[PDB]
Design a protein around this ligand. Sequence first.
Ligand SMILES: [Cl-]
Ligand SMILES: [Cl-]
Ligand SMILES: [Zn+2]
Lengths: 313, 76
Amino acid sequence: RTIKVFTTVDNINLHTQVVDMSMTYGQQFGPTYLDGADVTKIKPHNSHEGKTFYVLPNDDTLRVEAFEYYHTTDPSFLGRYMSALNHTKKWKYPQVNGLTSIKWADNNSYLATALLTLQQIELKFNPPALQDAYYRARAGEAANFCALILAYCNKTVGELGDVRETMSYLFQHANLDSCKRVLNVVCKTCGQQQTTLKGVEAVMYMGTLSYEQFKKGVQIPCTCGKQATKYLVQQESPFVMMSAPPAQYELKHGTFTCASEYTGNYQCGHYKHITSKETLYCIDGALLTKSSEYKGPITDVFYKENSYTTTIK
Amino acid sequence: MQIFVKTLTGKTITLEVEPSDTIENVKAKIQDKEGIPPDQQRLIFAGKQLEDGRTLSDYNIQKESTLHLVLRLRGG
Ligand SMILES: [Cl-]
Ligand SMILES: [Cl-]
Ligand SMILES: [Zn+2]
């Protein structure tokens, strides 16, 4: 006795299989999943006829397809993605003034903040998996995108998280190749040192939330023992992320794209997302509060950019 | 060679290091001196996040250079 089923690594390229109904999926395919559920130790059932099963790559065809879809060789990736998916399919993805959010569940506030952010910055994902899941997420069906973010960032459902770290890992999988940052450090004694950063390093900064302050100059130690001034010479990127340890900060309407608010301490906290539209919006999972002003403990601010050149001589 | 590491309180820490030391190596030296677990630590050089499995030489960090130690957030 046998049924036909489809095996896949990507849910786009399906491989017809004839499965011996007296053996477990595991003995026949290796590790096997059905709509996120692990069926490795399970024997084929009648109503499995015609259904699609994910399998761990166990041959050169599945290996190539897996790499082309996900851009990773981690053999733990599929199981981690499938484990997260069982939870993320149970979350609720409300539309909050045209953006997909997540209702609070399983310590997901950092994830909802990242998801809202990704819908507001210009980013091209390289892995087809992230490109496809992103478009579904933007339409309200974000479960696969959320499970992929957890898999790529090596996070488990319910684990506490850092938006800055989540954005950073996801940016490794974005086409930021042509993003460029030039910095100048001026010591009155030693002279001027210019540095060029590219890709992810060109769009991140940890130390100040203010894009304007980065342009104007920040005081840093010079190895001579004096204070030097560091300033942005040139920025070529569609956005910048400015981060700092969480601190009371005033967000002014029209002067930024969106921001992460972190309330709590280094053991436990809660993120809210602030975005600048016709007024200031504070999105807390499914809840939306509109205000003319906002002050709170901010840790990330995103600004839109194309090309900036300093006038500092 | 010595580097300096500024903590969130403004405490400055001296470490003994070598240009080929990985970031993980520097995190152990801070775990030794302050007892902070390496997994909580994030090392910053003049705004740039230093990543595990790159060296001080990779980032052109030289003697008398100052790093910043920040900690991962725990949002839920
Ligand atoms: Cl496939
Ligand atoms: Cl994309
Ligand atoms: Zn100097």
